[PDB]
Amino acid sequence: SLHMIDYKEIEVEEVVGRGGVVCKAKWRAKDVAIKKAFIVELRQLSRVNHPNIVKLYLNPVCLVMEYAEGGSLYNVLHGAEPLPYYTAAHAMSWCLQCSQGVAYLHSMQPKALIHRDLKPPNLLLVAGGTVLKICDFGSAAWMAPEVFEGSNYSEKCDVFSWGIILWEVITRRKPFDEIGGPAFRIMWAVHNGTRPPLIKNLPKPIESLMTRCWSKDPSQRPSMEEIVKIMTHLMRYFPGADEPLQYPCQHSLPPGEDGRVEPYVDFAEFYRLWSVDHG
Numbered sequence: 001s002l003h004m005i006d007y008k009e010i011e012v013e014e015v016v017g018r019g020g021v022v023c024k025a026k027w028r029a030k031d032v033a034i035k036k037a038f039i040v041e042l043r044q045l046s047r048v049n050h051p052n053i054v055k056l057y058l059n060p061v062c063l064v065m066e067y068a069e070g071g072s073l074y075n076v077l078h079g080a081e082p083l084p085y086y087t088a089a090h091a092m093s094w095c096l097q098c099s100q101g102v103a104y105l106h107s108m109q110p111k112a113l114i115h116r117d118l119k120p121p122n123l124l125l126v127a128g129g130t131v132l133k134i135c136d137f138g139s140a141a142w143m144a145p146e147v148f149e150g151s152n153y154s155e156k157c158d159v160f161s162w163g164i165i166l167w168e169v170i171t172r173r174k175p176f177d178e179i180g181g182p183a184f185r186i187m188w189a190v191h192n193g194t195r196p197p198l199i200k201n202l203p204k205p206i207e208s209l210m211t212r213c214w215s216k217d218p219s220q221r222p223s224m225e226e227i228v229k230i231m232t233h234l235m236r237y238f239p240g241a242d243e244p245l246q247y248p249c250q251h252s253l254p255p256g257e258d259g260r261v262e263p264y265v266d267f268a269e270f271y272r273l274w275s276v277d278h279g
């Protein structure tokens with residue numbers, strides 16, 4: 001199941017991020033990443049093998065994870081200029097691959113694994129930004145209200161997070177940036193029913209799926225198995241998800257007003273391909 005580390009053949013080079021400490025390395029001519037009693041639980045969970053989950057490959061103690069050239073979704077969406085251009089197909093593809101990884105964890109025997117902290121900073125991008133990989137593990141903006149309400153929670157809390165992420169890559173906005181302040185202000189907001197503003201000209205199938213994920217009552221949210229199928233079938237109307245991110249962008253963000261917001265991506269081509277099939 002596991003490959004052992006001697007440290008000698010792990011050639012550390014440069015530092016990555018500060019969210020523990022993370023460093024890039026080379027191990028058997030493979031770019032790889034590396035990082036207190038929490039690993040005891042990680043032994044039982046590390047039976048994972050999925051394309052959309054970071055491949056989990058001891059003095060000091062180290063966890064060896066495959067390196068993701070492309071950084072985090074969060075940094076692609078909101079990071080330092082220059083920011084890349086991307087399309088509706090990218091946004092849908094990222095979310096689809098996200099739900100494929102989350103469904104895998106939900107289907108693990110003997111018991112399902114809930115990710116809990118599903119958010120763009122833990123979604124990594126590979127192969128020119130086209131492949132998303134969950135990095136298993138201020139989260140208020142993506143947390144289902146029943147979780148920080150303390151009450152026991154199911155795996156529907158990831159469905160909630162996925163819904164928020166879908167709004168996030170479509171609009172290229174940080175959810176609940178208008179509220180901000182300390183975390184408890186956002187928790188109070190979403191607990192009372194506040195949700196990201198709905199999106200101008202969004203396709204009703206997508207609006208319907210997104211808002212179902214946002215439901216207060218977790219039992220009214222869809223399973224991730226259902227997410228995956230919906231998103232799989234929708235991709236027929238979003239060609240282009242394998243095109244690398246390479247084109248620049250100078251991102252202008254208008255204020256929100258009249259209770260709605262405009263998307264970043266453009267669905268024009270979706271309404272075109274849809275009407276070709278539907279009459």
Ligand SMILES: *CCC(=O)Nc1ccccc1Nc1nc(Nc2ccc(N3CCN(C)CC3)cc2)ncc1Cl
Nearest residue numbers: 016017018019022033065066067068069071072135136
């Ligand atoms: C498993 C969750 C986790 O640890 N996520 C995380 C968060 C921050 C930094 C590293 C990291 N883990 C991994 N990172 C990579 N590759 C990678 C991450 C981040 C960057 N950028 C940092 C911000 N800069 C502005 C740009 C570069 C680059 C590369 N790969 C694997 C893991 Cl596990």
